């Protein structure tokens, strides 16, 4: 009974802690790559090329 | 597609010309169509 609730609390605490660590790692990894993607890998396809043959 | 336009004889421009302006071969000329949704 009550011991089982304690086991549930402990397991859930473990899940919360590992998710905390995972989220921190994800943010730390993403932020530099986030900058990389955001600043100067952005492009715009203004045109598309077409042979004069079909026109 | 320009590879089909010019027969084998047209490639002989410059020094390769068979000496017993000439519209030297170029790839099929492209028109650039705007696609960004503006004019």
Curated annotation (Swiss-Prot), chain A:
Localization per record = Nucleus; Cytoplasm, Cytoskeleton, Spindle; Chromosome, Centromere, Kinetochore; Chromosome
Q: Highest taxon of the source?
A: Eukaryota
State the family it belongs to: Belongs to the DASH complex SPC19 family.
Q: What is this protein's function?
A: Component of the DASH complex that connects microtubules with kinetochores and couples microtubule depolymerisation to chromosome movement; it is involved in retrieving kinetochores to the spindle poles before their re-orientation on the spindle in early mitosis and allows microtubule depolymerization to pull chromosomes apart and resist detachment during anaphase.
What is the additional note?
A: Present with 639 molecules/cell in log phase SD medium.
How does this polypeptide assemble, per the annotation? Component of the DASH complex consisting of ASK1, DAD1, DAD2, DAD3, DAD4, DAM1, DUO1, HSK3, SPC19 and SPC34, with a stoichiometry of one copy of each subunit per complex. Multiple DASH complexes oligomerize to form a ring that encircles spindle microtubules and organizes the rod-like NDC80 complexes of the outer kinetochore. DASH complex oligomerization strengthens microtubule attachments. On cytoplasmic microtubules, DASH complexes appear to form patches instead of rings.
Q: What is this protein called?
A: DASH complex subunit SPC19
State the taxonomy lineage. Eukaryota, Fungi, Dikarya, Ascomycota, Saccharomycotina
- Included stretch of the parent chain: 1 to 55 of 165
Swiss-Prot record, chain B:
> What subcellular compartments does it reside in?
Nucleus; Cytoplasm, Cytoskeleton, Spindle; Chromosome, Centromere, Kinetochore; Chromosome
Sorted alphabetically, the keyword list is: Acetylation, Cell cycle, Cell division, Centromere, Chromosome, Chromosome partition, Coiled coil, Cytoplasm, Cytoskeleton, Kinetochore, Microtubule, Mitosis, Nucleus
Q: A Gene Ontology biological process annotation?
A: attachment of spindle microtubules to kinetochore
Major location category of this protein: nucleus
Nucleus among keywords: yes
Record's GO cellular component terms: cytoplasm; DASH complex; microtubule; mitotic spindle; mitotic spindle midzone; mitotic spindle pole body
Describe its partners and assembly state: Component of the DASH complex consisting of ASK1, DAD1, DAD2, DAD3, DAD4, DAM1, DUO1, HSK3, SPC19 and SPC34, with a stoichiometry of one copy of each subunit per complex. Multiple DASH complexes oligomerize to form a ring that encircles spindle microtubules and organizes the rod-like NDC80 complexes of the outer kinetochore. DASH complex oligomerization strengthens microtubule attachments. On cytoplasmic microtubules, DASH complexes appear to form patches instead of rings.
Reported function:
Component of the DASH complex that connects microtubules with kinetochores and couples microtubule depolymerisation to chromosome movement; it is involved in retrieving kinetochores to the spindle poles before their re-orientation on the spindle in early mitosis and allows microtubule depolymerization to pull chromosomes apart and resist detachment during anaphase.
Say which family it is in.
Answer: Belongs to the DASH complex DAD2 family.
Recite the other comments.
Present with 279 molecules/cell in log phase SD medium.
Q: What is this protein called?
A: DASH complex subunit DAD2
- Residue numbers of the full-length protein present here: 68 to 133 of 133
């Amino acid at each position: 009974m009550t011991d089982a609730l304690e086991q549930s609390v402990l397991a859930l605490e473990g899940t919360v802690s590992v998710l905390k660590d995972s989220v921190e790692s994800l943010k730390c990894a993403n932020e530099p790559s986030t900058n990389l993607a955001s600043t100067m890998l952005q492009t715009k396809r203004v045109f598309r090329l077409v042979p004069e043959y079909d026109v | 597609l320009g590879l089909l336009q010019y027969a084998e004889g047209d490639y002989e421009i410059g020094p390769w010309k068979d000496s017993k302006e000439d519209l030297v071969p170029l790839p099929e000329t492209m028109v650039r169509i705007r696609v960004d949704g503006n004019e």
